[model samples]
Target: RPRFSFSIAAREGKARTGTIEMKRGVIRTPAFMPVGTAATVKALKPETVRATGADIILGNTYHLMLRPGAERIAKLGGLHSFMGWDRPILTNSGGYQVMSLSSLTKQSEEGVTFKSHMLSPERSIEIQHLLGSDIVMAFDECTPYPATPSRAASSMERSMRWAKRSRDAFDSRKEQAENAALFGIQQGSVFENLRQQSADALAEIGFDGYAVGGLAVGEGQDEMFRVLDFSVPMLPDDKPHYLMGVGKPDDIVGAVERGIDMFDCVLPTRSGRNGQAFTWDGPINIRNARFSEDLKPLDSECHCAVCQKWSRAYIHHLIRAGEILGAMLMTEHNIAFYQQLMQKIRDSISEGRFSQFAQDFRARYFA
Candidate 1:
């Protein structure tokens, strides 16, 4: 069962400062959680990931469930020991990925039967809860990017219905129910009124927290923020407001200003493996030949081990030579940079200067 709770510490405009206290650890609000799909954050080790200042990490329910099996993990001492992470882990509802990622799948009211047409919210929550999730997402379709208004409307209604089903299902599983924290997901596919409807429904159903879904799926930053402007306030201000599958540094900063509390993305780690480095100013392709002899740190502002000991030139060579350490170092650097960004965001909001901080940072990041 859960010994979990979330509380707000401060508010600067719409941006809230807070913390999520769970049995494993205390997660600072306005927090950025790195993705560890398949039970790991890819190239980095558990302690190395901790050193990045992340209070929690997200795991993919669909991926981990399909391989090695949930029962396999529960026997190995739940996900924490199996993955060697003692901190909190948040898993998705295991249904969205199938609808968005797969070619064709059947989804029925009884729950995908566990897929496309797709999973009832209950279906996504069940598989993930057995894996010993500290945080559970309500199952919902991650409405595809190009959906028609009517199509999005149909999907959104189903997702809201599923949210209630997922909540009922969570309470039914008494063993995990008391210890687990459930988050209802909002779906509208960029439609303000539908988003409002979905939000009202979840608010009525209630939850330990809430997540904003169906964004960042090819929608530009402006449009995404437009949704956030109206959508975020719809959820209770007292709970954690998570933004799903979001985005770069700027995307996160902008979302924070609109009152989002948590985020997960594959950008830093995935892009790092491909030789891209995100710095305070902007992103740089380390694989470029100009860096072959440039002995600079990946990011001059970064204090991570990779930056302290290696050079841009060396990392570039590793990427060029197809060496794995290149990815390890780059991943470590990128994660550390993201943590640093979050810390500053927390501090800025605490000081009632989030707008100024965002303004200064965006100017430099964009220019």
Candidate 2:
């Protein structure tokens, strides 16, 4: 069997840049994967999403299995053709959504059953595998924040056990394993000792990569970074470090500095639909009353098609009128901005200027 491949190409202090070579394609790291939960990046077409320089996109096993059916997707010739996305796709373990989206809940030493979380990590990996996903996430509990020490410990331990099961499941699917990758999730809420235990456990069980889970759930940036400080280094340096469901532009940059190589989030597309536009300075509201008369581009520094040809005033007008074109343009630009931001991060890391880049970005964006 061919192995998952990730090799560091450059390093800047704790930050590094690399390329993730998979059967589908090469994903450049310190990379940002746009969320396409329903098998689409929302308002933008697949080609448009690709044009932003994005190396990969995320798909949700929970939703895909729930309505359209993951098995059905496989029967339809897998997710790539179904969604019209030709590049690599990373699928979420059904764990997070099973907890967050499903209604009634039940969990046990074995796994969650009967919906709510409803699906085990093994199940999620199987569905993703059947869908022909390039990367499959190991099943693990997304231990919620504010959990007591004892509670967090138990949750992390269960997640580790399930991680093994997820691995076993993937291993048994020898056909899928040949072409896909699987990653484990680390869970410990916010405690260092628990995190260390989680990391060590995952290392013992082993995985193609590792994910930092149970974050961006309202722990605030300071605390998240605090956890990353001790947590990220615990994962193997050779495999990609994936920060699951992580965040704003600054958050992404900070995590990159902490050694995270890949990320996926709904922030850019979600916020864009809500009329928020991310700029070099900061996020701005495109539908704001004041922008109705403004003749400037969304971001004077942005060179995306939206900014190059459309004015803030026009977008503002479209948004104010509840026009769908407004959201399409907004989404395309925001995703472009995020991809551009990741590009800059990778460039700086490659050139050994990551420290200056991080420091300067905060002051300028948050200024």
Candidate 3:
């Protein structure tokens, strides 16, 4: 009702290409959103981030609400102006952090309470609304892996209740009600029935989009894929289906094959700073002794600034020598690698060749 539309331009099996038109901008589907967790995508400027072909970036409600304070940001200007990133920003409700980072977290029907990670003894949800995110995630507990079935089920139930509250809170804001979109996160660890139950419940609550949460938390790739096989199709096919914190290149391809339309992960940027580089063939550790004198580019196939201009020997030397420029260059390459992969996936879908693309990609990278 707030003038949003998504159109599938092409399809190849479950892999498809589409676009999401919102008040802020049009995002190409099967797209990867770079994580900008603390109001910035570390080491990269906002325009430089856009230049890598990212349509949107994610903001963490928990982090922002704690540090600098979302109210302080709004007083200056909204998050976009505060961060200098004009593109759409998706903010996760402080739920995951509450469960993962906060000390002495207590769960109840009312809501979660825990000592603030920033050393403050206050509680708040008002900060999220103040951030004015383009896509707001529902508050849900990220079920820790290896959890007992009963524990997972109980967590899913609590998350569902919080979803309703998060929806209501989001809808109450005049600005958010008018323009922003709320995405409900479906929880339920690895169990199919639990996943379906969570999906069904969120579907009833309804949202602009749906996210598959609680996976990639330590579950191996095989188990995660098994959940996606059954869980993704349960959500509304018309709206974008997001896979939260989803993984390496092969993981993305698998999720796309399962009909997931959106993804956000920190593998690329985080790995880059640690001397790892993702390539079309495989991941390479630049600090490895094997590349001590190798003059090759990080990826011969990649056309990113780092690849086009720098060599493995130089990056490796810089990294081993503890130079800051090494991290910057590697980050540029990693972000470029992800952007290129998304482009390739989009092209494969448009050409009705996703199956072949997926096969080839897995054949090369999955080993």
> Candidate 3: where is the Cα deviation over 4 Å?
1-3, 117-125
Q: Please name the candidate that would achieve the greatest TM-score relative to the true structure.
A: 2
- Per-residue lDDT of model 1, residues 56-88, tens digit only: 999887777767777787777888888998888
RMSD in Å for all candidates: 1.9, 1.4, 2.5
| Candidate 2 residue spans exceeding 4 A from truth | 1-3, 114-117
TM-score, cand. 1: 0.96
Q: CA lDDT, every prediction?
A: 0.87, 0.89, 0.85
* Ranking of all predicted structures according to lDDT, beginning with the best and ending with the worst: 2, 1, 3
Q: Which digits, one per residue and each the tens of the lDDT, describe model 3 over residues 53-146?
A: 8888888887888788988988978899999998788887777777787868877677676787421111333565677678878877888888
Error of 2 at 274 (Å): 0.3
lDDT string, candidate 2, 1-367, tens digits = 2346888999987788999888778899998999987888999899999998888999988888875888899999999999999888999988888878877678887677755235776677778887889999987788887899999999999999899899899988988778888899999999999999999999998888899998988899999999999999999888899999988999999999899999998999999999999998999999888898888999998878999899999999998898999999999999999999999999999998999989898999999
Ranking by TM-score: 2, 1, 3
Against the correct fold, how does model 3 do in TM-score? 0.94
Clashing pairs in 3: none
